[PDB]
From a paper:
Type 1 pili are important virulence factors of uropathogenic [name] that mediate bacterial attachment to epithelial cells in the urinary tract. The pilus rod is comprised of thousands of copies of the main structural subunit [name] and is assembled in vivo by the assembly platform [name]. The pilus rod is a right-handed superhelical structure composed of ~3.2 subunits per turn with an axial rise between two consecutive subunits of 7.8 Å or 7.7 Å for the type 1 and P pilus rods, respectively. All subunits in the rod are connected via DSE, forming an exceptionally stable fold that is resistant to extreme temperatures, denaturants and mechanical stress.
Our structures of in vivo-assembled, in vitro-assembled and [name]-cat pilus rods were resolved to 2.85, 2.69 and 2.52 Å, respectively. We modelled six adjacent [name] subunits linked through donor-strand interactions and refined the models against their respective cryo-EM maps. The Cα root mean square deviation (RMSD) from global alignment of the three models was less than 1 Å in each case (0.68 Å, 0.69 Å and 0.25 Å for [name]-cat vs. in vivo, [name]-cat vs. in vitro and in vitro vs. in vivo, respectively) implying that all three structures are highly similar. Indeed, the solid-state NMR spectra revealed structural differences between in vivo- and in vitro-assembled samples, where the resonance positions of a few residues exhibited small shifts, peak splitting and/or line broadening. Our experiments suggest that these structural differences occurred in approximately every third [name] subunit of in vitro-assembled pili, and that this could explain the observed stability difference. Additionally, we observed peak doubling and/or line broadening for a subset of [name] residues (V17, V23, V37, A69, A72, A93, I103, T128, F154 and Q159) in the in vitro sample. By contrast, pili assembled in vitro, without prior incubation with GdmCl, produced SEC profiles consisting of a void volume peak, a broad shoulder containing smaller pilus fragments of different lengths, and a peak of the unfolded [name] monomer. Following incubation with 4.1 M GdmCl, the smaller fragments became even more abundant, and after incubation with 6 M GdmCl, the pili had almost fully dissociated and unfolded. Taken together, these results suggest that when pili were assembled in vitro from [name] monomers or [name]–FimC complexes in the absence of [name], structural defects occurred in the resulting pilus rods, likely at the positions where small fragments associated to longer fragments. When such in vitro-assembled pilus rod samples are subjected to medium to high GdmCl concentrations, rapid fragmentation occurs at the sites of quaternary structural defects, followed by the rapid dissociation/unfolding of the resulting small fragments.
Author numbering:
A (entry chain F), B (entry chain E), C (entry chain B), D (entry chain A), E (entry chain D), F (entry chain C): 2 to 159
The structure:
């Protein structure tokens, strides 16, 4: 009887030519690292506790590819720390001398060039979960502030 | 003492003469369908796994109306596929022979003309959620690319 | 106390005896198609990915009219391609053998003469948005250059 | 090295002895009102929906002045409607019985004599923005046509 | 080897001499009020449900200032309702007798004169978020339409 | 029946002979730096917190090129600071001794001559995202004011 305007729906997705497809919950996931004390990042090379995040793969076909690796891309904090993400929230409130390190399943920090892939993980037919960890890395004496960071990843099927 | 310029706030809303009001989280929502392999859309009529999204109606009054239906409006991929959304992100990166198909609570695909309303759902006083599903539809051999799409919906109360 | 002259303000608008009124954001809008590779437009009939744009109608009264259609009027690239917009930015830099195609909600290219109206969209009282898509159309081997174009539209109410 | 003629650049500006300075984007701005229906302006005194626009003040010094007001100057539509702008685009095609009203931040229409100043908004050090609204005013039965208008403003500092 | 023109990037920001700095996500934010029924705004003085939004301050120094207040500036709907924002989207389609009220942390509606600051909130070193609410206010029998509004705010530190 | 003039639509884009094409959302994008305090920019060489932005590439073909680099072009603040964007808003109200630095994915600031390309990022078939950061740079004691800036970029494929 009465018809009114409702609104808009935006659909996001991608068609890939690969052995697996990234889950809808892994393409744009947010990782809450929590707070970290300055006393825990009081020197160069100091690290915080790790926070785990996963990249799920769906509809995997082991006949097409047997192993999958992930390479992360982002802004590095320095020219001597290529495996540490630079913080980026705003222009005023952000921690200095602090970055974010992404660790593959072997526990090694991945360099953020978009070309160095992590350790290959064998795939099974179906749903695959690749484990990663993230932590704060101190390039000096840390100062308080926001510690948000962003990165993109690509998956290599071989 | 010290007063500085802060910024600007924009308020978006609508006043409707209807039995229900669309929730602020449903008037403009993003649905992340994730990725789909090209191998899963290798023929005309192929479909992917469905992703659900809801349209929430607030402050519903059953004395005004008891049933609600939703009609979507968007560009169609072809004249032979009038229930398949055409992808629209940019001029370079997009999947070909692929479209987004919107499913109502009965599993049928809705016509994207803004005049074919979904199955009517009984309303109760207060908050009502109308379930919907979105998937990918292949009008041929799919090719890799971005698969973003947009559509608008209206709500009919009777 | 101190009075100085500030400037000038210009107001643009129209009064129409129609069922709806075009929104202020739709009477003069810019659509960013983005870049497209010459490799994707390497032959006659080649098309690019589509970019969407909407023409919003406000204060619609379904008693006056229930269906709305839109015709477009611009310079055609050729007499054998009457649905392709010719590019026009300057005298030096522009793409050759490239045009702009406007697609209505059925996915069909519209003739650019201001007399071939698109598919009639059902109207509801209040805000109405009519979806359109724009893409690049190759009338030959495309060559690099700017690809700016423009057109005027008129709305038919019945 | 080939040297060719390039063209001409014209610089516009003004040196003011005032507390603030009008932004380069506010000295000459175009306000797009959109379309309005004759049915919404079918009687004397009928108003349309308002469209907002701002006049921005830069480099404000509160030590010189603390309050700024704006007076608008233009051709009135009648002797009994001195706060309604007369339309002016060309000798034909303009709307009759329609005018433009500039609304203060208190919602009151401003007299278009260049001497009635608006509400005195309080200034802060730095960028300052004064909100304004423009709407269509019907002095009779509105007729279709173009509804362009122009006005000039001066800023009072005290 | 192949160099092409990419595009343009625009950087927006402000340098302030204040105890805090407004976050990049708070200087220009959109608040989605959602829809409201005319039945909920059927009389003068009727209010809708509130939608919350925050203004975030970064790099706060409690040594410089301990309390922060926010004053909003915009066009008032009338002269008796100086705390109700006037709607402004286009010349047609907006709601009538409907406004937007901004409520501070104490629930009181703020006068939109740009000089009546909200309740003082104590600042802590680092990130501070000031809670605000926005609701709909009826100045009579509400009529259907778009209900967009805009306002600017300034932050006082003392 | 009733046909009225609707308005104008302008299509903007480019045809490029390159390995990738810049996304429509990256050809002309506005990034919000936010506010920054003069206390954080109180000396030459002082920097602010970084704000990230991306240049998305679409329809990438790794058979044409495997790496992409971006060079930015704009007005430098001084002769000794060739990698700091000069602020440009208007004849009044801008900040002094403040500029914008665009940081490569390696964390280094880029020279703004349109010929110093950033570090190459490996490309994959399909959508590619190149990360960048923007911050404020002080060439002296910063003064309050607006801090808007502009720059153009070009992409090298090799």
């Amino acid at each position: 009887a009465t018809t009114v305007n409702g609104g808009t729906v935006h659909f996001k997705g991608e068609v890939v030519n690969a052995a697996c497809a990234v889950d809808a919950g892994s393409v744009d996931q947010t990782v809450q690292l929590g707070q970290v004390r300055t006393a825990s990042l009081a020197q160069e090379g100091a690290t915080s506790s790790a926070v785990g995040f996963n990249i799920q793969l769906n509809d995997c076909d082991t006949n097409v590819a047997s192993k999958a690796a992930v390479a992360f891309l982002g802004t590095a904090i320095d020219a001597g720390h290529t495996n540490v993400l630079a913080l980026q929230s705003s222009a005023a409130g952000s921690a200095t001398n602090v970055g974010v390190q992404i660790l593959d399943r072997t526990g090694a920090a991945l360099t953020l060039d978009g070309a160095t892939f992590s350790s290959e993980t064998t795939l099974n037919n179906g749903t695959n979960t690749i484990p990663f960890q993230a932590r704060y890395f101190a390039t000096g004496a840390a100062t308080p502030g926001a510690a948000n960071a962003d990165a993109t990843f690509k998956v290599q099927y071989q």
